[PDB]
Amino acid sequence: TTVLVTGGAGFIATHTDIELLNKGYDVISVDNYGNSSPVALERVEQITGKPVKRYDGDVRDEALMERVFAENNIDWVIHFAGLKAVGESVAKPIEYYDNNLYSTLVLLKVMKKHNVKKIIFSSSATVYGTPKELPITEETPTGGTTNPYGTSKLFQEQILRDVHVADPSWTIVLLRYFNPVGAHESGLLGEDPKGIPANLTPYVAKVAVGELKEVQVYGDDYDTPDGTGVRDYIHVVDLAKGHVAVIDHIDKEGVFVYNLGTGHGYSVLEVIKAYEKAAGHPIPYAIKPRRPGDIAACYADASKAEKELGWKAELTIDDMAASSLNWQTKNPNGF
Amino acid sequence: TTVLVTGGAGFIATHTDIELLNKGYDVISVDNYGNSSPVALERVEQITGKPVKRYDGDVRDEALMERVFAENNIDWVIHFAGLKAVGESVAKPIEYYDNNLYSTLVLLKVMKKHNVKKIIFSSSATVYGTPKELPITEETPTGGTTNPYGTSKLFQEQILRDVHVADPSWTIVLLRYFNPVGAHESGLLGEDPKGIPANLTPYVAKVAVGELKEVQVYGDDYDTPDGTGVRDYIHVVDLAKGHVAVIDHIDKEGVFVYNLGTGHGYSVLEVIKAYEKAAGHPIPYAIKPRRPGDIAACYADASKAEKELGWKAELTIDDMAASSLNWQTKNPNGF
């Protein structure tokens, strides 16, 4: 079984690539390295002793995607390629919509043309907006999105649902990830965005090891116990394993929806404290204004994925922080 | 004042082009003639005695759109370019999403780059789905869309709203058209799609003049008085005049929303009867199964546009049918 992994050099993709290769799948990557390094795929190969067939370029490049499908016999696609910062999306809506919607559309066109009709889409807790109830289930209504990123994910979900209406031989798996953190136990791979990290934990990891000065806490006036945002952090290895469980268990047509989270919510301040415990020293932080697009609190009821896929994310916030720092200590400037 | 009219050779665009030119605006067209003829723009020029500067090609062609903006000093854009059949959209979602979303995204990118920040978007009563109340106002909730076409219009509305969040110097006018019908009084221009017409009235006009055999009535089991779909038909000339009223009256930043309809709903059977009255003979029809994506009934409360723009659509269903047949009798195979 061959899996095409778009954005295949990114944070969640590289961890997924490991888990797929360890389970004897063959893996192909396409990535434009806008938020990642080609060295990450070298590390996947190092960890697994298995090849990743690498293509360099943009998922919106129809000629490139045509080559990918013409040169390979692909069974499944996992579509990670996307821009993913809630705050940046509010400021750069067209960059987000172009990248995120048009990558999906070009990919679907090529997949249809080659009759490859099994996709896992990297969707997001952001599709629930300000959650109608907590914890969030797959029955919690979507919509009320607060930022173009989240809107783009909900749009993409609908586009995919409409592909299945028009051709019900498709298998569409909408995985709504919550907030992955951490690194493969080896410390040879981890989260390495380009520029200043937009996500909380890679920023915190850099402050812990002295590569950035001060954690910027975006808002302390949310309707949460300590005022800072609450999220369901999931170890990136657990999330990666979730993808293998889908491909292991779903071999029929249909639209399938799963929340992938732990069910444990942690505030920003609690995350910093988990890193302080892992580092053995204070990590400087400052209270800053709210970031546009952020909501107060979201976390998952992932019962459905446990029942249907046999999968649960049990690595802890301490496992996340420790594995993160292990990577960052060994690789303080990343790749 | 120069207006770029994308889809500028289409049904509603060509009527709008006339009304703009008669009011002393300068008009530029870009169209790929997927559902129209270049001859239509010759007829606009004939009617008005004014030029239409013509570009041939696709709004998704960034190099073409760059040329359009580099070669001309554009004040306003009216974005008509789109695929527009509810039923076809259910069967061809990716064609619809690609054409409709990516044309908009390429256009916005170029407009931003040239600091042209005034747009009228051709939106649709379909954004209301199955209407929460009748008649529909601009306060009627959107969503519940029943077909990828309608979904694509609601998506585009949100993309445009997000452009204004990111740069509130924009003027965004979302015009939700109901169902335009009819032809310029000259009969030298009218509705001329390529292929078998997907809309009701061009099909009915062709059956009336013997160019098609039988009106296909899609469903007679809707929750309406006679069982057939109910719509708010608006004379295409009134709708065209609505666009001039926007540009005449709105010269400030902001997001502005208008329903453009008559407030008079007519069933399919009533439309056929209006054409029979205009033709002076029966027009054969048959009851057929429902078309995917169609809803029972929608019509507009257009009070807001009357107050804010001084505009009302008062041409009648008889004016629509008669002007339609006048065009079709003079041009039985269109252009």
Ligand SMILES: NC(=O)c1ccc[n+]([C@@H]2O[C@H](COP(=O)([O-])OP(=O)(O)OC[C@H]3O[C@@H](n4cnc5c(N)ncnc54)[C@H](O)[C@@H]3O)[C@@H](O)[C@H]2O)c1
């Ligand atoms: N918290 C999370 O990190 C989280 C949660 C839910 C969903 N997601 C989604 O999961 C996916 C992956 O997230 P991640 O944390 O691994 O981010 P990431 O930035 O590390 O990975 C995405 C990758 O896609 C690549 N890419 C982006 N657009 C591309 C394009 N047009 N063509 C080719 N390559 C492109 C980037 O270069 C990068 O390697 C994204 O779609 C994201 O929205 C992430």
Ligand SMILES: NC(=O)c1ccc[n+]([C@@H]2O[C@H](COP(=O)([O-])OP(=O)(O)OC[C@H]3O[C@@H](n4cnc5c(N)ncnc54)[C@H](O)[C@@H]3O)[C@@H](O)[C@H]2O)c1
């Ligand atoms: N009842 C109606 O007809 C109605 C109601 C509400 C909204 N609308 C919207 O109004 C607009 C115009 O409707 P119309 O009835 O004039 O249809 P139309 O098909 O006559 O006009 C649209 C035009 O756009 C052109 N076009 C389509 N995609 C293009 C692309 N990518 N690049 C260049 N040109 C392209 C076509 O060739 C055509 O000339 C559409 O966006 C439609 O969705 C129509």
Ligand SMILES: O=c1ccn([C@@H]2O[C@H](COP(=O)(O)OP(=O)(O)O[C@H]3O[C@H](CO)[C@@H](O)[C@H](O)[C@H]3O)[C@@H](O)[C@H]2O)c(=O)[nH]1
């Ligand atoms: O430097 C930072 C970064 C973040 N935060 C806060 O930390 C929390 C998590 O923020 P972040 O890591 O930016 O993640 P989210 O915005 O919750 O979004 C992530 O999680 C979503 C699913 O929940 C994914 O879809 C997104 O792609 C991914 O970026 C939020 O409360 C932020 O306000 C800070 O205080 N400082």
Ligand SMILES: O=c1ccn([C@@H]2O[C@H](COP(=O)(O)OP(=O)(O)O[C@H]3O[C@H](CO)[C@@H](O)[C@H](O)[C@H]3O)[C@@H](O)[C@H]2O)c(=O)[nH]1
């Ligand atoms: O051959 C036909 C065509 C249509 N209908 C019916 O006639 C009505 C109008 O149909 P149609 O002309 O296809 O228009 P709509 O589907 O209502 O959509 C039009 O009106 C929308 C705004 O209401 C626009 O956004 C769309 O682009 C435009 O195609 C509907 O009840 C249809 O079921 C028939 O019975 N036979």
